[PDB]
Ligand binder design. Structure first.
Ligand code: FAD
Length: 149
């Protein structure tokens, strides 16, 4: 993967505002800000890579910015951080992974409980919520994920 990052950074605050102001919320998230664990992935780059990770996310997972950026978030599904696309996870519920996959493809909001592992191999249940995000063109370009241990 050779993901490219937006020169000048991402409008994370603007996107959080967009999310809290969305008209027909399918999932209630309650107020959110930059203090919580979150990531923004680019739907328009190969394998929906993380292009921004909040400090709280890195702290929760134990991974560094260098270890997460440019990667699809699925690495959290294995204690060795090695998860190949389309592979059958041995520690994660297949229907759960398919639910996330379909929600992302359809730009549909979703909330799931998925088993994840921190960098040091510590297992935990991640209550994950993903909401599609529109960029300046007004069309869905990113997805913001909010992780909860
Ligand atoms: C912003 C954002 C944040 C995210 N944060 C996290 C996070 O914190 N933790 C995390 O674990 N993931 C996270 N994800 C999810 C991850 O990045 C992938 O989107 C997710 O694993 C599903 O996509 P995939 O490409 O891995 O699917 P695939 O690799 O295709 O795997 C889907 C699995 O489902 C099974 N399956 C497929 N179709 C069917 C079917 N019809 N019936 C039965 N089984 C089926 C397969 O056997 C396969 O193993 C995040 C995604 C985004 C966009």
């Amino acid at each position: 993967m050779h993901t490219l990052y937006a020169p000048g950074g991402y409008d994370i605050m603007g996107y959080l505002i967009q999310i809290m102001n969305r008209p027909n919320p399918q999932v209630e998230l309650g107020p959110v800000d930059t203090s919580c664990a979150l990531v923004l992935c680019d739907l328009k780059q190969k394998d929906t890579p993380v292009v921004y990770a909040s400090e709280a996310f890195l702290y929760m997972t134990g991974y560094s910015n260098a270890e997460v950026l440019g990667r699809n978030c699925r690495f959290l599904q294995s204690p060795d951080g090695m998860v190949k696309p389309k592979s059958t996870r041995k520690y994660v519920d297949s229907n759960t992974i398919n639910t996330m996959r379909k929600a992302i493809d359809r730009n549909a909001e979703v909330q799931v409980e998925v088993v994840n592992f921190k960098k040091n191999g510590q297992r935990f249940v991640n209550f994950l919520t993903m909401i599609p995000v529109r960029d300046e063109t007004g069309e869905y370009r990113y997805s913001m994920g909010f992780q909860c241990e």
